[PDB]
Amino acid sequence: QCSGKQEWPELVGERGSKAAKIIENENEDVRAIVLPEGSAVPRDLRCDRVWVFVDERGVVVDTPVVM
C-alpha cells in the first residue's frame, strides 16, 4: 500500500516538465518520468514511480498516477 498523494488529474493539460516537478514536490517518495503518450512500460506495480504521458507538444494527456 502506497503512502501520500496517488493521482494528479489536475495536471492533465500542463507541460510535462512542470507536472513532473509538482508531482515530486507533492509526494516525496516518487520519481516522475515524462514519456510520450502510448510508450510501452513494464507491467509491475511500484509506490515510487509516476509515469507522465505527454502528447507531441509535450503536454500531459493522461492522468499521472503512482504505479
Numbering used by the authors: 3 to 69
Paper text:
Recently, attentions have been drawn to another member of the potato inhibitor I family from buckwheat seeds, BWI-1 (Buckwheat Inhibitor 1). Interestingly, BWI-1 has an uncommon binding loop sequence with a Pro at the P2 position and Trp at the P8′ position, suggesting a unique mode of intramolecular interactions between the binding loop and the protein core. Here, we report the crystal structure of rBTI at 1.84 Å resolution and the structure of rBTI-trypsin complex at 2.26 Å resolution. Within the loop, the P1 residue, Arg45, is an ideal substrate of trypsin, which ensures the inhibitor's tight binding to trypsin.
